[PDB]
Amino acid sequence: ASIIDTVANLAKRRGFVYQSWDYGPLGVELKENIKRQWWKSMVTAREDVVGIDTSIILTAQGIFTNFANVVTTARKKPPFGIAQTGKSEFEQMEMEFFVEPSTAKEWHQYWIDTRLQWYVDLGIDRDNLRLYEHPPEKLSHYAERTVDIEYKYGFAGDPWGELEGIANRTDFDLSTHSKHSGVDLSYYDQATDTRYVPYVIEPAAGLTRSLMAFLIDAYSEDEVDKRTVLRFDPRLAPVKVAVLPLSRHADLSPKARDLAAELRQHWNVEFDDAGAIGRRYRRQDEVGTPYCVTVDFDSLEDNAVTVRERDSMAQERISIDQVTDYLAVRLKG
Amino acid sequence: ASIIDTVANLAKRRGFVYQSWDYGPLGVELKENIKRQWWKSMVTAREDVVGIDTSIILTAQGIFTNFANVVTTARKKPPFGIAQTGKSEFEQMEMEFFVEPSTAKEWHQYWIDTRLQWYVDLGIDRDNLRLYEHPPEKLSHYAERTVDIEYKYGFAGDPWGELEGIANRTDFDLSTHSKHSGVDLSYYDQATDTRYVPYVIEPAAGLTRSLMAFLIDAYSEDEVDKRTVLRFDPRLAPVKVAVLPLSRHADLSPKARDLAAELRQHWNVEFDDAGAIGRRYRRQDEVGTPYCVTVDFDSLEDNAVTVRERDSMAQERISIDQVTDYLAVRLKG
Ligand SMILES: [Mg+2]
Ligand SMILES: [Mg+2]
């Protein structure tokens, strides 16, 4: 079986996806973590980018139409961006970056690079990412230049697939909307330049494609005794912590559950006392849980817990009073 | 003008909503904060509730169909819940809580109370919330009992409106799906009870209605010199912090912007040096920013900043090194 078939079998088995395709309990968490990271690094982390959410009663058009409004209430001037999570019925994280046409090309390259680095910063092997520029044959009527980030999914024939497209649509969008709506959307310069209709650089990433890329790239099988493991970035892992009492003994449970409640205040935690500890470690590793917290009888007097890191499996026993902080620093976000 | 007209004018003016209706830059942040709080207190904060996301190609049905799968991969037994953000084209935060029929009524009351408290815990005046039980005339064919939480929006005639419905749909849903799909979804008991098809308690809250209720309830006008203010809970405010240098002097900006960058790592921050400080304080108050951080020339040597709290307007000057923590403790989430 191919890598894709293996990962899909795992995803169905552990509830990442359910055959229908619908996202199961882990799939929703991974999807929302991906969306949160995209919004964080695109909207809230950038002063020149603000968000918007439009209705698609039956998508990027909803941004252009509201351009004027955004310029007024948000008090933004080019270069600046408007981001959105558009239900293209698959979701798509898209952004329209309005810039002076003179800089259009420079900005384009910027967003071609930044976006790529984004994926790399979340744990994707750069060797599994590449750039594919559309020739004039592909270039849409409005797009002067189009560059697709492509990920090595592992298909038959061509193993690469589009993951995100960054296009230079020029001034076609705003000009069309101005002509059709009878409203001037021009930012004619009165400061060291001439009149222009803002050019648009459009990064658009299919959320499903992003999740598939992260899931496939995180897969690993390392020894002997083989171990299937999703090496997710901590910010993307569906489950951040696993509170695993050493046994079902009624002494460990009342304290391990209190610790799990403390942790659930902040992160999504999974509590499991079923069976042997090694099986539970393998369970958590299969779904990329970055840390496991084990409570044993020695904790009833020593008042500590064993923290096991996913990839290395190295264990460190630390005071139960500090666990939260010890995890926060390591979980980020 | 009515309270609703006033709040709507403010929302359009400040970009909460744009006339089309679409959410502007602040509206998206408020909406996502509401959704995050709902998911946090319903899914990640409860071990007996897990999430799911289904496709609605043209909503609660998608949950029932996947019930079996969830019971297998999630390893859950009744009483337990499955939550979802269903695109009913308006979004709706819904949950299906499967329970043994014997407890169905008790659990029902629980979710009638808990949900209500949820709103109250996020800053809604309990006096503006009420319960409305549907008579048998209203009770749907499948619903034995139906209770709507209603909020005092301020309409004409009847000023109340549905905000969230909590229904006891009995075993109609799973029984229908079993008959139609040829799959047994029964949890026939083999432990101190008899055979049953899990009963369903359904809390469903319209996200738009929730956002409208929060926006309306947060509105206030307090003196003299009147001050319009959205008294949002810190977890719901679209903007958590406002870095406001005392003036555009080139000495304050390079440091205030560094502080704003530090804060943007964590929260959504708004930087504004335009005009007088009082006007900027009023701007931030109009949209419910819980804290304003002012940098003045005294900071260039004292290395401190003035933190102004929204409601009280009380100011406290604290070291710029501690600001993040000082805000974290006060912003929650
Ligand atoms: Mg921004
Ligand atoms: Mg849960």
Residue numbers in the entry:
A (entry chain A), B (entry chain A): 2 to 21, 32 to 69, 164 to 193, 209 to 343, 351 to 460
What does the paper say about this structure?
Glycyl tRNA synthetases (GlyRSs) are prospective drug targets for combating Mycobacterium tuberculosis (Mtb) and cancer in humans. Structures of all three forms – complete, or in some cases partial – have now been determined using X-ray diffraction or cryo-EM. Both Mycobacterial and human cells express the α2 subtype, and notably, the GlyRS gene in humans encodes one product that serves both the cytosol and mitochondria, which has obvious advantages for the design of selective inhibitors. Similar to the TtGlyRS, the two Mycobacterial GlyRS subunits adopt the canonical architecture consisting of an N-terminal catalytic domain and a C-terminal anticodon binding domain connected by a β-hairpin insertion. The catalytic core contains the class-II specific antiparallel β-sheet having the characteristic insertion domain after the first strand of the core β-sheet, and the anticodon recognition domain adopts the HGPT fold also found in HisRS, ProRS, and ThrRS.
Crystal structures were also obtained for the AMP-bound states of the two orthologs, and in the case of MtrGlyRS, the apo state. MtrGlyRS was readily produced using standard protocols, and 37.3 mg of protein were purified from 2 l of culture. Despite isolating the monomers during gel filtration, the two synthetases crystallized in the canonical dimeric configuration. Strikingly, significant portions of the dimer interface and active site are unstructured in the MtrGlyRS apoenzyme crystal. Remarkably, the interface visible in the electron density map of the MtrGlyRS apoenzyme is quite limited. The disordered sections include nearly 30 residues that form intersubunit contacts in the more ordered dimers, with greater than half being hydrophobic. Interestingly, the theoretical dissociation free energies estimated for the glycyl-AMS-bound states exceed 24 kcal/mol whereas the value for the apoenzyme model having more missing structural elements is less than 1 kcal/mole. The pronounced disorder observed in the apo MtrGlyRS crystal supports this notion: the insertion domain and two tRNA major groove recognition loops are absent in the electron density map. These flexible features could offer strategic opportunities for achieving selective inhibitor binding on the basis of the “flexible target, rigid decoy” model. Partial priming of the enzyme for tRNA binding is most evident in the series of MtrGlyRS structures, which includes the apo state.
